[PDB]
A paper describes a structure:
Activation of the large-conductance Ca2+-activated K+ channel (BKCa channel; also called Maxi K or KCa1.1) occurs through depolarization of the membrane voltage and an increase in the intracellular Ca2+ concentration. BKCa channels are composed of a tetramer of the pore-forming α-subunit (Slo1), sometimes with auxiliary β- and γ-subunits and LINGO family. The α-subunit of the BKCa channel has seven transmembrane domains, S0–S6, and a large intracellular domain that contains two regulators of conductance for K+ (RCK) domains. The voltage-sensing residues are in the S1–S4 transmembrane domains, and the S5–S6 transmembrane domains comprise the pore of the channel.
Residue numbers in the entry:
A (entry chain B): 224 to 615
B (entry chain A): 18 to 51, 91 to 335
The structure:
């Protein structure tokens, strides 16, 4: 009838059918032999039974339980039990676990996400494992950051193990999971990318052969671009030589809403830029990990060092009152009236190409509506930049 | 008066079956015939459910306690006759159950609020437990005449323990999670099977006008089930009525594997003692 096409279903139906068949048939034989007597006693030792008791007795016997309630009493019945044991025990003990295993192999993390108005959700994909998830989630949801309002959605094609289940549960209100792939354009429809905001890509840093890892990442970017051109992407890469191919795919927009973060380039860049002055590597690398201020009282170096560890780097637009002034003067004003420091200015030309300047000189003055980077302990403090008049 | 056993089960059946209806209709009630404050309530309930703040923490601990409390009340109620009367304005028991159930009702409501997909939440293992346990106490207080039937399900709640431990940030290791989960499943199945054997047998199967009763107290049923599960066998206690035997057959059919599989693993996880530790 073309009703059982797959593999497992055939196994399950065949097993259940044979089992029920033999069980009922054995019951029937016991009933027939027992209700009737025996020839060579001239039919004089009949034991009154009904089918129900017989099937009960068979299921008691097969599973090795046993009971003192009912037992076949005539010769033929006992002989039949003696023989039937030899097959039935093996049959039961080698079929029941199989049937239990085949059924119930259900994917627990199926289903699909839902879109809620007024909020925003992102996606991740790639090397999902306990260390990486812990680090990423710690950095993402840390309290020092500005008031966060997002949700996080994961994808992967290996069912997460027990240990990771702890983290995925502990943030029951901020993390959700969906088994699947990223190469199957049905899965990438479940996660609802078409209304997302970005899709980060964790990449395995400690791989054996570098080439395969970045190749797979390339194809992942290819597929995600295939489902939609107007998406944002932020990923990892492992050697500068292969980074360029990602420049080629048709819709990456380096100018607008796109980027790529290598490792080798940034690694050697930190080392080199520190070659001119010791320790600059650490000073940079500590600016990009969210940390909170600490108390230490022992007069070691640890206290004076943690004094500055927990600083971070933020961005905010300026105030209109500071346009017609001097960059040195406004820097001094910021520090003296704010206890806050700034490094660089975003962009100044009245052209369609955006350029970034660090530490401008004294031939530049602020225009209306300019963004500016700052370094301080918490984002809320940075925001004091909105306006300063009538404050002392 | 005349037996009122029928009414209690019915009140319950109405809620679970009736609920599936309204939920199906609302999904199918659209005209096509196929940040919101509501979402703020959703988020507030969600954070309250698990360990997100002090208030939620005390709530989870209180649930962890009151579940065991209700399980304790169940044992005390065992030895009473099958169906009699207890005045509500005089005693202390049947009030502790009342307070426990009014609490479980709110804990169920809060869970129902903070669920992404209503339908599959409604048919979830933890849910039907409350569906089959909360009505009869209210109905009893209405009629002043309670009934033992279908109160053994109140033991299933232990399945939640794993979850209501993980939020508290107490179990972060593979082995501990595995062991706790297995022991929870095992104890729950054992006690609930005991409970079912007790209600059907002490009362008579209705096929023959309730005249086939065989006396048995809850502890005895615990023994019958343990002897059967492990295959040891004995002739000391064998269920006699039809329903009991049928349930025994089905239970042996699947679940004997449970005792043949879990116990070796539980024994293996415990006892991995590092003999040459120390200093
Ligand atoms: C094996 C592990 C999982 C624990 C198993 C627990 C049971 C073996 C024990 C624990 C609590 C016991 C119950 C605790 C208290 C009582 C009340 C006790 O006394 C009364 O019912 C009072 C009136 C009367 O004497 O009839 C009767 C036994 C009973 C139900 C006990 C029956 C046996 C129980 C269920
Ligand atoms: O109601 C009954 C049933 C069986 C017999 C009966 O009596 N003698 C024999 C036998 F086996 F010796 F030939 C049998 C018999 C045994 C096994 C089978 Cl499968 C079929 C018949 C009878 O007489 C009356
Ligand atoms: O005189 C009888 C009547 C029914 C059965 C009987 O047989 N099988 C089943 C079952 F449940 F498996 F379907 C049942 C059964 C059980 C409960 C009810 Cl309420 C009604 C029928 C029987 O054995 C003997
Ligand atoms: O008084 C007696 C007679 C024969 C046997 C007896 O013993 N063994 C067998 C067997 F199974 F090998 F055939 C038989 C047997 C079986 C069927 C028939 Cl029809 C006749 C004899 C017995 O046990 C006791
Ligand atoms: O003390 C009692 C216990 C059970 C019944 C009883 O009687 N008939 C039925 C049935 F099943 F046929 F509907 C049942 C029954 C069976 C299973 C469950 Cl779980 C609950 C009730 C009763 O009447 C009085
Ligand atoms: Ca800080
Ligand atoms: Mg959610």
């Amino acid at each position: 009838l073309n009703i059982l096409k797959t593999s497992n279903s055939i196994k399950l139906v065949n097993l259940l059918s044979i089992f029920i068949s033999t069980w009922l048939t054995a019951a029937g034989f016991i009933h027939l032999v027992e209700n009737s007597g025996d020839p060579w006693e001239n039919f004089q030792n009949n034991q009154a039974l009904t089918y129900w008791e017989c099937v009960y007795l068979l299921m008691v016997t097969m599973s090795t339980v046993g009971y003192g309630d009912v037992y076949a009493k005539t010769t033929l019945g006992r002989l039949f039990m003696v023989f039937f044991i030899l097959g039935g025990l093996a049959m039961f003990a080698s079929y029941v676990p199989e049937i239990i295993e085949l059924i119930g192999n259900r994917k627990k993390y199926g289903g699909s996400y839902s879109a809620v108005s007024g909020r925003k959700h992102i996606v991740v994909c790639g090397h999902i494992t306990l260390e990486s998830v812990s680090n990423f989630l710690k950095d993402f949801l840390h309290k020092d950051r500005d008031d966060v309002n997002v949700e996080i959605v994961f994808l992967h094609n290996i069912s997460p193990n027990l240990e990771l289940e702890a983290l995925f549960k502990r943030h029951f209100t901020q993390v959700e999971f969906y088994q699947g792939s990223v190469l199957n354009p049905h899965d990438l429809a479940r996660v609802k990318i078409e209304s997302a905001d970005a899709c980060l890509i964790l990449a395995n840093k400690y791989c054996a052969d570098p080439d395969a890892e970045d190749a797979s990442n390339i194809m992942r970017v290819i597929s995600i671009k295939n489902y939609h051109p107007k998406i944002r992407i932020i990923t990892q890469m492992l050697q500068y030589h292969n980074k360029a191919h990602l420049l080629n795919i048709p819709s990456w927009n380096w100018k607008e809403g796109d980027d790529a973060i290598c490792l080798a380039e940034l690694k050697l860049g930190f080392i080199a830029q520190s070659c001119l002055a010791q320790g600059l590597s650490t000073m940079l690398a500590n600016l990009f990990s969210m940390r909170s201020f600490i108390k230490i009282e022992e007069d070691t170096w640890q206290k004076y060092y943690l004094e500055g560890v927990s600083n971070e780097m933020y961005t905010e637009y300026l105030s209109s009152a500071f346009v017609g002034l001097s960059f040195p003067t406004v820097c001094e004003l910021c520090f003296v009236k704010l206890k806050l420091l700034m490094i660089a200015i975003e962009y100044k030309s009245a052209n369609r190409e955006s350029r970034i300047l660090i530490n401008p000189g004294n031939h530049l003055k602020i225009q209306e509506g300019t963004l500016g980077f700052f370094i301080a302990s918490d984002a809320k403090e940075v925001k004091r930049a909105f306006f300063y008049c009538k404050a002392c | 008066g005349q037996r009122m056993w029928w009414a209690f089960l019915a009140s319950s059946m109405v809620t679970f079956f009736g609920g599936l209806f309204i939920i199906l209709l609302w999904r199918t009630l659209k005209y096509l015939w196929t940040v919101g404050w509501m979402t703020s309530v959703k988020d507030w309930a969600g954070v309250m459910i698990s360990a997100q703040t002090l208030t939620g923490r005390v709530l989870v601990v209180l649930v962890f306690a009151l579940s065991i409390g209700a399980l304790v009340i169940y044992f005390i109620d065992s030895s009473n006759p099958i169906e009699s009367c207890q005045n509500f304005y005089k005693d202390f028991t049947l009030q502790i159950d009342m307070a426990f159930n009014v609490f479980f009702l709110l804990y169920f409501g809060l869970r129902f609020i903070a669920a992404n997909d209503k339908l599959w939440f409604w048919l979830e293992v933890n849910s039907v437990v409350d569906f089959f346990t909360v009505p009869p106490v209210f109905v009893s207080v209405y009629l002043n005449r309670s009934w033992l039937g279908l109160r053994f399900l109140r033991a299933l709640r232990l399945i939640q323990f794993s979850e209501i431990l993980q939020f508290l940030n107490i179990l972060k290791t593979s082995n501990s999670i595995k062991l706790v989960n297995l022991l929870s499943i095992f104890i729950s199945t054992w006690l609930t099977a005991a409970g079912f054997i007790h209600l059907v047998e002490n009362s008579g199967d209705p096929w023959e006008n309730f005249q086939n009763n065989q006396a048995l107290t809850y502890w005895e049923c615990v023994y019958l089930l343990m002897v059967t599960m492990s295959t040891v066998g004995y002739g000391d206690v064998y269920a006699k009525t039809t329903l009991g035997r049928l349930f025994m057959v089905f239970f042996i059919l699947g679940g004997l594997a449970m005792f043949a599989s879990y116990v070796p693993e539980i024994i293996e996880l415990i006892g991995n003692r590092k003999k040459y530790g120390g200093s």
